[PDB]
């Protein structure tokens, strides 16, 4: 994508993940996911979103 | 001084005496730990293994039933996935000691299963769902499959739950063994037997074997009383072992046969409803290695005296207050006893 406010490369990534993935995950913590973005200067991590079975 | 009986001069004060008492405590705890370590590791290993094995069996049965629903009744998915997951989650929970009613598990399972069968297999074409849930029980549409499943799974899950609780309680009592605190007089006698010889200026004098025997019989008075209850616990566990996996695996076959039994009367059912609305090897090996420890509480004072520096010859030894040429001669325990009595009554009433 390209932003209107400023002409710079924007990137949007989507990840699905099924119920079978969470119910079959037997880790110690809640099924969490993090987002890492790569730049010419370095990297940046986002919030850890934990997908859980209600 | 208050522990080492001062026959004459002495090289130690009261503070060095308290130091010797603390070292005696540490040495006794270490000896009990060394005595109990092998049995403790055996029971901890088996407890972990059987818990993991049962969880694996539950998961395997769960998605085997899921696969059978997906292959034979695709019209009942994904609702079948949801209530099968709920049922097997409750099964695993009941296995792990939670307050769960097995009959209620089966009843909720069939009450969730019947409406989707009616709407997707018999009458293809929602808010009257609770009425259908009622019709599941009021017309007894599944016949005797629910009671059969109730008994089959209740028997096995109850014996499995009691087995896991028994393993954990054995771990608990064997772990309390090496942490047993004794009386003040027993501590002073252990200090006199092990270290008070140093206060008199002796370097390599060891306590008398008979003196160690009398000291340990005075100390382990209540501890030996646990032997009868421990033997009865081992025997009751052996009675209980002589299965949870077979029932949970045949669950899907039984459910498929129940669905076919229900479908065999659809002609009148739709009209009247529209009108109204190596595991066995592991248990055997554990029992065989555990029977070798039935004399754990009876041989413990002998172990403590034989695994400590003693003058077995009873010649030139420390009797507790002087160098002689020849020796002349409950609450925590009650807690262990009560827990053993409970688990033994449970194992007795099961088989």
């Amino acid at each position: 994508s390209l932003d209107e406010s400023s002409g710079l490369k924007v990137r949007e990534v989507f990840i699905n993940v099924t119920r079978q993935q969470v119910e079959d995950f037997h880790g110690p913590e809640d099924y969490w996911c993090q987002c890492v973005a790569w730049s010419h200067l370095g990297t940046s991590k986002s919030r850890k979103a934990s997908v859980r079975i209600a | 001084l208050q522990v080492c009986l001062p026959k004459g001069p002495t090289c130690c004060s009261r503070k060095m005496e308290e130091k010797y008492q603390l070292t005696a405590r540490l040495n006794m705890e270490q000896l009990l730990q060394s005595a109990s370590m092998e049995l403790k590791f055996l029971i901890i290993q088996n407890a972990a293994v059987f818990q993991e094995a049962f969880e694996i069996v539950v998961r395997h049965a769960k998605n085997y039933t899921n696969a059978m629903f997906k292959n034979n009744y695709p019209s009942l998915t994904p609702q079948a996935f949801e209530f099968v997951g709920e049922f097997f989650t409750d099964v695993s929970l009941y296995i792990l000691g939670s307050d769960i009613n097995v009959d209620d598990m089966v009843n909720e399972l069939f009450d969730s299963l019947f409406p989707v069968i009616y709407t997707q297999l018999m009458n293809p074409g929602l808010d009257i769902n609770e009425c259908l849930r009622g019709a599941r029980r009021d017309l007894k549409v599944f016949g005797n499959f629910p009671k059969l499943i109730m008994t089959q799974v209740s028997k096995s899950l109850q014996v499995t739950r009691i087995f896991l609780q028994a393993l954990n309680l054995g771990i608990e009592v064997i772990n309390t063994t090496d942490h047993l605190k004794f009386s003040k007089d027993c501590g002073r006698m252990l200090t006199r037997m092990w270290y008070c010889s140093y206060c008199q200026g002796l370097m390599m004098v060891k306590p008398c074997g008979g003196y160690c025997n009398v000291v340990m019989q005075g100390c382990m008075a209540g501890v030996v009383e646990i032997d009868k209850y421990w033997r009865e616990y081992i025997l009751s566990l052996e009675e209980l072992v002589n299965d949870m996996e077979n029932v949970l695996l045949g669950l899907f076959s039984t459910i498929h046969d129940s669905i076919q039994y229900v479908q065999k009367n659809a002609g009148k059912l739709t009209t009247t409803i529209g009108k109204l609305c190596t595991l066995s090897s592991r248990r055997r090996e554990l029992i065989q290695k555990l029977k070798s420890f039935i004399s754990f509480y009876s041989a413990l004072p002998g172990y403590i005296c034989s695994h400590s520096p003693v003058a077995e010859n009873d010649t030139l030894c420390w009797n507790g207050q002087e160098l002689v040429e020849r020796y002349s001669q409950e609450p925590v325990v009650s807690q262990i006893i009560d827990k053993l009595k409970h688990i033994n009554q449970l194992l007795r009433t099961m088989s």
Binding site: P28 | I44, E52, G97, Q165, N168, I171, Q335, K339
Partner: protein, 148 residues
């Protein structure tokens, strides 16, 4: 005259292994004053037999520790020259809560080179659940990736 209805029936209670519980009993109205007697599972209990149990002047059964006097169907019974009257039996069940064990040692990495595994066990044995006590809450195993 002795009445049928008890003034206050004993209440069933859930008490931990160390907890203390008092069973209250108010016998029915009658002349002379009803003699209250406690029966554990339809069998009388002797107050002098154990330090843990004692009978009070105001008809109360006090248990300090749930160890010396475990679970049962305690029933209060009033006796008089007229007749005897049985109260509603209280189902006293002693429940043991689950308690975590310490973290064991980390196992050796199964794989010699690359991604390995290290395990740490945590059993539910200090104390182990009894008489249908709540099981330990949380995870039992700990696994970490190791690089040798």
């Amino acid at each position: 005259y002795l009445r049928k209805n008890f003034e206050q029936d004993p209440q069933g209670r859930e008490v931990p292994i160390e907890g203390m519980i008092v069973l209250h009993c108010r016998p029915p109205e009658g002349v002379p004053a009803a003699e209250v007697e406690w029966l554990k599972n339809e069998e009388p209990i002797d107050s002098e037999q154990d330090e843990n149990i004692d009978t009070r002047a105001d008809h109360n059964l006090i248990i300090r520790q749930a160890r010396l006097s475990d679970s049962g169907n305690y029933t209060c019974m009033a006796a008089n020259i007229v007749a005897k009257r049985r109260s509603l039996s209280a189902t006293v069940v002693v429940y043991v809560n689950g308690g975590w064990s310490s973290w064991t040692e980390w196992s050796a990495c199964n794989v010699r080179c690359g991604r390995g595994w290290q395990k740490r066990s945590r059993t539910c044995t200090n104390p182990a659940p009894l008489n249908g006590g709540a099981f330990c809450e949380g995870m039992s195993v700990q696994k970490i990736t190791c690089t040798a």
